[PDB]
Amino acid sequence: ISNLSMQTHAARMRTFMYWPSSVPVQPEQLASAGFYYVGRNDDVKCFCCDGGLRCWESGDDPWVEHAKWFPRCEFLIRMKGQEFVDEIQGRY
Ligand SMILES: CN[C@@H](C)C(=O)N[C@H](C(=O)N1C[C@H]2C[C@@H]3C[C@@H]3N2C[C@H]1C(=O)N[C@@H]1CCOc2ccccc21)C1CCCCC1
Numbered sequence: 001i002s003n004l005s006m007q008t009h010a011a012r013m014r015t016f017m018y019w020p021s022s023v024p025v026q027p028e029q030l031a032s033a034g035f036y037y038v039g040r041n042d043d044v045k046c047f048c049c050d051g052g053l054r055c056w057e058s059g060d061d062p063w064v065e066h067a068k069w070f071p072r073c074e075f076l077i078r079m080k081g082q083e084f085v086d087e088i089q090g091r092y
């Protein structure tokens with residue numbers, strides 16, 4: 001999968017075909033936060049920063065996890081704002 005082909009939400013959604021139903025985070029929330037499914041286990045990558053996330057847990061919010069682990073991502077900042085990212089990074 002080409003990162004460029006994943007710049008739009010609809011394209012990212014279609015990558016989740018065989019996404020394990022047992023994982024307690026849904027494709028719609030993942031795709032909204034920039035992620036697409038790379039086709040192994042529960043591994044997803046962001047189309048913009050290429051950050052990879054896995055081992056989704058109950059109650060995870062994909063935007064929070066994006067800001068926790070990849071705070072410099074420009075798509076994250078454009079969508080959620082620098083204030084949000086600063087707070088997740090523990091700067092109040
Ligand atoms: C609990 N919520 C989940 C989303 C979470 O926090 N996952 C963490 C994660 O995805 N991370 C951890 C961070 C730490 C550091 C910033 C780097 N990591 C990114 C990410 C990760 O493990 N990514 C792997 C390794 C790199 O390659 C890929 C490629 C695709 C998908 C995932 C990853 C890890 C996964 C392994 C179990 C423990 C939580």
Ligand SMILES: [Zn+2]
Binds near residue numbers: 046051075076
């Ligand atoms: Zn990103």
